[PDB]
Amino acid sequence: ITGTSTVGVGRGVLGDQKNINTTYSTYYYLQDNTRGNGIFTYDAKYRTTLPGSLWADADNQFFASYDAPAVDAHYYAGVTYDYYKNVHNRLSYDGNNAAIRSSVHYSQGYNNAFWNGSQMVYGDGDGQTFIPLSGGIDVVAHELTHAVTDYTAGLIYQNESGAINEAISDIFGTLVEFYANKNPDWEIGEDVYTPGISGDSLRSMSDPAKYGDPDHYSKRYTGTQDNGGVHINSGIINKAAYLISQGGTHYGVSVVGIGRDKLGKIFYRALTQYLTPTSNFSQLRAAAVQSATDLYGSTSQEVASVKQAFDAVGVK
Numbered sequence: 001i002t003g004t005s006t007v008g009v010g011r012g013v014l015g016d017q018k019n020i021n022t023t024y025s026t027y028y029y030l031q032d033n034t035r036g037n038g039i040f041t042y043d044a045k046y047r048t049t050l051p052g053s054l055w056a057d058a059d060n061q062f063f064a065s066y067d068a069p070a071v072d073a074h075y076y077a078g079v080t081y082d083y084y085k086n087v088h089n090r091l092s093y094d095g096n097n098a099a100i101r102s103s104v105h106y107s108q109g110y111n112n113a114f115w116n117g118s119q120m121v122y123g124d125g126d127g128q129t130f131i132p133l134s135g136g137i138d139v140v141a142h143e144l145t146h147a148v149t150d151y152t153a154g155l156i157y158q159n160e161s162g163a164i165n166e167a168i169s170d171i172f173g174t175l176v177e178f179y180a181n182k183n184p185d186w187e188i189g190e191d192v193y194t195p196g197i198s199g200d201s202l203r204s205m206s207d208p209a210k211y212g213d214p215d216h217y218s219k220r221y222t223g224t225q226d227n228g229g230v231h232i233n234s235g236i237i238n239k240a241a242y243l244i245s246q247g248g249t250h251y252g253v254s255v256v257g258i259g260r261d262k263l264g265k266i267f268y269r270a271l272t273q274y275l276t277p278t279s280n281f282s283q284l285r286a287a288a289v290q291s292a293t294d295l296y297g298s299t300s301q302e303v304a305s306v307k308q309a310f311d312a313v314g315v316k
């Protein structure tokens with residue numbers, strides 16, 4: 001909408017207060033004009049029609065329970081935009097400052113979030129399996145990263161290419177969580193998953209097997225559930241990424257860690273220069289090796305660590 005840029009205040013899903021960029025024109029709208037061609041947050045009103053209505057508020061204060069998912073979707077989309085711009089020199093998901101759109105209050109009791117090809121969509125959860133999923137910065141960044149992938153490598157959402165697609169979203173979701181630097185970890189979705197159970201999460205990158213996911217290529221799933229295991233086999237790549245950054249010895253193979261910033265540089269370059277819609281795990285290894293070679297040199301520790309990490313997870 002046309003209006004003037006304003007700054008509202010509200011509370012997110014986890015009860016924390018934050019400022020949000022809004023737009024005033026009769027109402028205050030969840031429209032942040034400070035980033036690219038805008039960040040826009042919509043109310044889906046418990047229905048499944050998308051996007052719903054651009055979020056309108058009479059007083060620029062967003063402290064109602066109903067407001068909390070919208071506050072966080074809007075704010076964490078801004079953090080994710082900032083990460084891609086400041087760290088990777090990428091302007092929004094398309095590299096040309098496309099408007100970022102999210103809808104909250106999607107459906108009833110909806111235990112998921114997704115990118116629908118055009119926008120982010122967040123369920124509220126059923127209150128037992130999840131609370132509203134936009135409360136997780138890693139979840140928000142996971143979703144926006146699907147848009148980045150779709151505009152760049154274009155990894156098809158099934159089998160190995162789809163597991164790479166998923167791992168890219170978990171990797172960058174985690175790197176955005178570390179960028180914001182509030183309780184960062186190598187777990188996925190811990191802030192919004194199972195409010196009645198402490199210490200769990202959807203997935204673990206440091207130890208995928210904790211939540212049943214493979215941590216070695218010999219344990220990959222090749223059935224048909226979950227688009228050929230895209231959220232399952234992602235564990236093999238998530239583990240490799242964790243090892244590149246943090247190091248460790250896994251199935252007897254030792255990896256010297258090189259840190260998160262270099263992990264992100266290597267995988268961002270692989271995603272945007274070398275991967276294609278059909279890349280498999282072996283081709284990801286080759287893309288990561290080439291990316292590290294470009295950035296750090298063929299004799300570098302960084303290249304050596306990429307090779308050891310993929311060796312450790314059984315990907316040649």
Ligand SMILES: [Ca+2]
Binds near residue numbers: 058060061063
């Ligand atoms: Ca209000």
Ligand SMILES: [Ca+2]
Binds near residue numbers: 184
């Ligand atoms: Ca965390």
Ligand SMILES: [Ca+2]
Binds near residue numbers: 174186188
């Ligand atoms: Ca996390």
Ligand SMILES: [Ca+2]
Binds near residue numbers: 192197200
């Ligand atoms: Ca929990």
Ligand SMILES: [Zn+2]
Binds near residue numbers: 142146166169
């Ligand atoms: Zn995903």
